[PDB]
Coordinates of N, CA and C in Angstrom, one line a residue:
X1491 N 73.5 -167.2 81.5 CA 73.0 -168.5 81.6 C 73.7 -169.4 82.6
X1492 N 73.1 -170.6 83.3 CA 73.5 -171.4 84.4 C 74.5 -172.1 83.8
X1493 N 74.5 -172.2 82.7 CA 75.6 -173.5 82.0 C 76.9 -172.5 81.3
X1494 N 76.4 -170.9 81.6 CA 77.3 -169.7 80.3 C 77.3 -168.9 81.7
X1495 N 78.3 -169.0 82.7 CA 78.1 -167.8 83.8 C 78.4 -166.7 83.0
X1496 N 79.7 -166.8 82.1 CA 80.0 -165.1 81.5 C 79.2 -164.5 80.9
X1497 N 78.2 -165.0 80.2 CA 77.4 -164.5 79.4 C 75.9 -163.7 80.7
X1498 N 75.7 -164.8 81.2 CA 74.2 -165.0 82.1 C 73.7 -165.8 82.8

């Protein structure tokens, strides 16, 4: 996610 870089 844009707001979760670690995730995605």
């Amino acid at each position: 996610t844009f707001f979760n870089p670690v995730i995605d």
